[PDB]
UniProtKB/Swiss-Prot annotation, chain A:
PANTHER family: RIKEN CDNA 2210010C04 GENE (PTHR24264:SF15), TRYPSIN-RELATED (PTHR24264). One of its GO terms (biological process) is digestion. It comes from Bos taurus. It is found in: Secreted, Extracellular space. The keyword Metal-binding applies. This is Serine protease 1. Belongs to the peptidase S1 family. It is an enzyme of class 3 (hydrolase). One of its GO terms (molecular function) is serpin family protein binding. Interacts with SERPINA1. Disulfide bonds join 7-137, 25-41, 109-210, 116-183, 148-162, 173-197. Transmembrane segments: none annotated. Residues 1-221 form the Peptidase S1 domain.
From Swiss-Prot, chain B:
The chain holds residues 37 to 93 of 100 of the full protein. Residues 4-54 form the BPTI/Kunitz inhibitor domain. It comes from the Eukaryota. The keyword ATP-binding does not apply. Keywords: Disulfide bond, Pharmaceutical, Protease inhibitor, Secreted, Serine protease inhibitor, Signal. GO terms for biological process: negative regulation of platelet aggregation; negative regulation of serine-type endopeptidase activity; negative regulation of thrombin-activated receptor signaling pathway; trypsinogen activation. The keyword Zinc does not apply. Inhibits trypsin, kallikrein, chymotrypsin, and plasmin. GO terms for cellular component: extracellular space; serine protease inhibitor complex. It is found in: Secreted. This is Pancreatic trypsin inhibitor. It comes from Bos taurus. Its main location: secreted. Disulfide bonds join 4-54, 13-37, 29-50. The record marks 14-15 as: Reactive bond for trypsin.
């Protein structure tokens, strides 16, 4: 996250880290056995780390639970990035508590201008590389589909939305993928792609979770 | 154009996945951050794969 702030330990209790010997993506806990992330975050052998703040230290609230299933949307297109969503089943149920908690799925789509909270352990520099120890947070608005298409001609599908600031300085970045975009207590987006980080005229692009709620519920219930 | 001579490509997705690329200036396979989508070919899951494909380019 570029241009954000330190969240504070366990203030975003639905945020998880996906670990393959190191942190490579985020995710969002949606019930005690299931996480939502991005399809491009698929790897075999994922370990889900819950209750994290400092991801380079053991602080006392962590739960480390292996994935037992990592299910990519059946229509994910790895060239256009359409349908960039994945569901991860935990091999055992997480113990839910004040620092490990689920986030609700949306009941309707959010509108342009709605302010959301984006979080993750991704790069904090727009030029160069600095990866944080602790979780970072950013408040950003959803942008109109018209502005999103203007920013990225020919690239925005009905399953994507843009969020951020056209002047630059505030965005998700490498290592934030798969993580949450939460608006009024609902998981509306998944960190997906962009063009550089925090560049002028290049807002972040996010998977539009409200289009997948029926699929998410049925897939979780069938697995 | 030899793909082993192309600079490493992070791409547009926002993961932080460690991959290998052949660095012809150094003569060795090196690590870089891959964002998870739209990989170019100078992008390997292991040093051994990179050395096999690109070593000596
Ligand atoms: Ca920790």
């Amino acid at each position: 996250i570029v241009g954000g702030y330190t969240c504070g330990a366990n203030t975003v209790p639905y945020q998880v880290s996906l670990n393959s010997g190191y942190h490579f993506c985020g995710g969002s806990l949606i019930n005690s056995q299931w996480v939502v992330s991005a399809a491009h975050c698929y790897k075999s052998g994922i370990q889900v780390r819950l209750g994290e703040d400092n991801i380079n230290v053991v602080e006392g609230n962590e739960q480390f639970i292996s994935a037992s299933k990592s299910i990519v949307h059946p229509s994910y297109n790895s060239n256009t990035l359409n349908n960039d969503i994945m569901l991860i089943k935990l091999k055992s149920a997480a113990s839910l508590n004040s620092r490990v908690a689920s986030i609700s799925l949306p009941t309707s789509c959010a509108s342009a201008g709605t302010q959301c909270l984006i979080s993750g352990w991704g790069n904090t520099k727009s030029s160069g590389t600095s990866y944080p120890d602790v979780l970072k947070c950013l408040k950003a608005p959803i942008l109109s589909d018209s502005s999103c298409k203007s920013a990225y001609p020919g690239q925005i599908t009905s399953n994507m939305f843009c969020a951020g600031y056209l002047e630059g300085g505030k965005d998700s970045c490498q290592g934030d993928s798969g993580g949450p975009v939460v608006c009024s207590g609902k998981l509306q987006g998944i960190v997906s792609w962009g063009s550089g980080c925090a560049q002028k005229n290049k807002p972040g692009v996010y998977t539009k979770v409200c289009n997948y709620v029926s699929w998410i519920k049925q897939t979780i219930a069938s697995n | 154009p030899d793909f082993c001579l192309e600079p490493p490509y992070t791409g547009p997705c926002x993961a932080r996945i460690i991959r290998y690329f052949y660095n012809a200036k150094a003569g060795l396979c090196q690590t870089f951050v891959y964002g998870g989508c739209r990989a170019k070919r100078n992008n390997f899951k292991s040093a051994e794969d990179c050395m096999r494909t690109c070593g000596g380019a």
